[PDB]
Amino acid sequence: MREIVHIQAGQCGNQIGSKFWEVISDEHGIDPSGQYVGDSDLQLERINVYYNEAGSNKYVPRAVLVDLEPGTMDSVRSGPFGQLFRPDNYVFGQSGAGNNWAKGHYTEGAELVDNVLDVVRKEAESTDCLQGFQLTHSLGGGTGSGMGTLLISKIREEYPDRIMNTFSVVPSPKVSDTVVEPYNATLSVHQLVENTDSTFCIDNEALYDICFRTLKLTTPTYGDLNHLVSATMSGVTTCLRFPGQLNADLRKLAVNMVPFPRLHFFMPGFAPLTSRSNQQYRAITVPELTQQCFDAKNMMAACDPRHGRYLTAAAIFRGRMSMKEVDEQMLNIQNKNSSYFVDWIPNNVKTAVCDIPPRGLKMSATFIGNSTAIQELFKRISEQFTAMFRRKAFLHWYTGEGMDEMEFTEAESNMNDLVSEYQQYQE
């Protein structure tokens, strides 16, 4: 009834999407071959939101796989859940864009986007009522950022009314691995601001810090980070798939978060993250869940939440729990930390409860916060971009594809505009 189109662009996007589909299949009790092996009838009540019926009790994800490097596609297909998808949905090119935004946006991206849009439209026309689009990508890379910008622009042109949310991985200096990644981030934030209803910023540095401190992982891998992102994404859309005391789907959340159309960058979080030893000795309670949701460390943005003020914050809970127990906790949070919430909004907090927890978990809470603290990431990106653009660090590679230098100057100004308006309400 409210199905969602899922697209994965770039290596990081494909890996995150594969982990997310694995997590969803675990939640829905779906065999990797696509067959249903769940033990509850409630799972199949709203399985159509993410999967398409294959008739013989088989279900396939409504996912579109696109990547310019066939190696990632081959790895995903050979992965644990490769056979879950259908071979028709796979889209790939010949060679990667080479971390070049212009290469992946003007020539190679322009050549592939025809097939990408064709398969996306074919998937979209098969739905009952398309709730919206979700896309997984990384701003640091070239292929992912360019293809994501081009595809989101095309979908906004083709779907002027549907919700578009992107789960982007925002690069940070501490775990930086690409020399030219600030250029890609600067070129992508422009289109993200222009044509995205909500963009969830993810920092690898923050994920590593959480895994090291709270999780106490001996040696975190990309699988663990992808699992964390997948759990958060599943928690976000739990209202569409399962019943609850207070339903909060994508549209209601989008209305309740953004004060203004272009301030649509959220910072997520997840509650029940607990170390191995503390799992058996921690009394998981709604106060504990909300305390760790509002904890600075648990937050997946490297920017400190205290270095700013929360405009709007939403916490989505899963499992059976009394409404009053959640409302009192929200009031306590808003009273104790009143300095961290903006006064001009009468009720800064949004709540949501779902009756069905994640599989194997008693109850979970998913937190998303639209705070002005996100401006620190954009400030760092703008500083790096200006430092590189002052001496024309790598502009010849991008101009070789025909992209004009004037585009860089305009994007930097729009970068300033996004920071300025965030700073406009920052006090």
């Binding site: 490097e69 066939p70 190696g71 080479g98 590189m388 660090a393 790598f394 590679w397």
Partner: protein, 428 residues
């Protein structure tokens, strides 16, 4: 899927290719006679024979005859072993103008035939030496023709550069200066290596009292395998050739990075070493561990690429990068705060039987674009100016078809390149 063509010119290039193809056969399990992921370097025939995507050309057939009678005689398809009648006699003019045209047509036709065989041509690999006559004139002609024919295709090469003291030919500076003009003109990225630095590495780290050309070629082949592994082996943070060029080429002319393979240590010592990621990353930046005879502390690092292999975890890489950045001794340009290009591959390096390298669990090859490399250009320019002030051996070159003014044009081009290196390194 993603193929790359290797072309060998000159005795140095031919021997380096011999070593690197031996290493590739060891890595992929291909038997030395061609019997038996590998599509990057080899073409699988219907009968099961595996043919390397390599071209063997040399004006003197003796070095090629060595392979034709050696272990790998059945490895290479016979037409790939192009030979001339007599070498260039260490003369760039002889190598290019008077002679090289005799077989340049056949060589380029063979290159075109090999290219049309594959579809995913990522780029080209050229092995040669500046000092030699063939590996400089023929290399110049072939690579400029290749660049004219293809253009946007990647063009990588590994060139041996004359040592400050170890010079086996008197006319090395002349040919090196003549080639430096065109290697700046067509090559997308040139990997310059000095023999003296490899000798010092073998003497110090490997503790070998009597090194040889075999060890040098083995190390070069190991570095080429490390750079090309990302195109044929799985691993998080894959680094393609195009990604490599985008990362380490900030300016169209500044495309001459260094190269080094860090975990080079004796076998009897390797067993008693932790070889942690942080330790190997720290000792990557050792001034004496760079295979170009120039102190990195003299210059400033501008763009650095790391290609980790084996048991590598990204968090350890991040910690190593942070520790390196905290080290103020390893200076960086102020306008490139994030010049580190991290690359990880899950395939550990292999050890050549009889080779000096030990079976380390993890390895990394560090390729940095630094201004310290200008010392080699300074030395070569000083040598060329001293040898050309009196026109020591100009008569051979002018008699072999080239004009006198070409030497002056090459010298002024070298001066311009050195000026560009000096200017790019200034603060903003």
């Amino acid at each position: 899927m993603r193929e790359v063509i290797s072309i060998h010119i000159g005795q140095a290039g031919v021997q380096i290719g011999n070593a690197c193809w031996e290493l590739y056969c060891l890595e992929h399990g291909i038997q030395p006679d061609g019997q038996m992921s590998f599509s990057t370097f080899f073409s699988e025939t219907g009968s099961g024979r595996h043919v390397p995507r390599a071209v063997m050309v040399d004006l003197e057939p003796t070095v090629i005859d060595e392979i034709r009678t050696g272990t790998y005689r059945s490895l290479f398809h016979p037409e790939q072993l192009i030979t001339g009648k007599e070498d260039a006699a260490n003369n760039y003019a002889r190598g290019h103008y008077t002679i090289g045209k005799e077989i340049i047509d056949l060589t380029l036709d063979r290159i075109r035939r090999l290219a049309d065989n594959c579809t995913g041509l990522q780029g080209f690999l050229v092995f040669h030496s500046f000092g030699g006559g063939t590996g400089s004139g023929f290399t110049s002609l072939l690579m400029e023709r290749l660049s004219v024919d293809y253009g946007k295709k990647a063009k990588l090469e590994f060139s041996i550069y004359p040592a400050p003291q170890v010079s086996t030919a008197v006319v090395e500076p002349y040919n090196s200066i003549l080639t430096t003009h065109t290697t700046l003109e067509h090559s997308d990225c040139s990997f310059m290596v000095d023999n003296e630095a490899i000798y010092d590495i073998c003497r110090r780290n490997l503790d070998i009292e009597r090194p040889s050309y075999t060890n040098l070629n083995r190390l070069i082949g190991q570095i080429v395998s490390s750079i090309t592994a990302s195109l044929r082996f799985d691993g998080a943070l894959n680094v393609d050739l195009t990604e490599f060029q985008t990362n380490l080429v900030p300016y169209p002319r500044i495309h001459f990075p260094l190269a080094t393979f860090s975990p080079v240590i004796s076998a009897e010592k390797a067993y008693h070493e932790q070889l942690s990621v942080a330790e190997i990353t720290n000792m990557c930046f050792e001034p004496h561990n760079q295979m170009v005879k120039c102190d990195p502390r003299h210059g400033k690092y501008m763009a650095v690429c790391l290609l980790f292999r084996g048991d590598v975890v990204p968090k350890d890489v991040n910690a190593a990068i942070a520790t390196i950045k905290t080290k103020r001794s390893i200076q960086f340009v102020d306008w490139c705060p994030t010049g580190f290009k991290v690359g990880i591959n899950y395939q550990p390096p292999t050890v050549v039987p009889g080779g000096d390298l030990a079976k380390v669990p993890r390895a990394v090859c560090m390729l940095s674009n630094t201004t310290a490399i200008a010392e080699a250009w300074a030395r070569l320019d000083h040598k060329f100016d001293l040898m050309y002030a009196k026109r020591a051996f100009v008569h051979w070159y002018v008699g072999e078809g080239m004009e006198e003014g070409e030497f002056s044009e090459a010298r002024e081009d070298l001066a311009a390149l050195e000026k560009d290196y000096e200017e790019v390194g200034v603060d903003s």
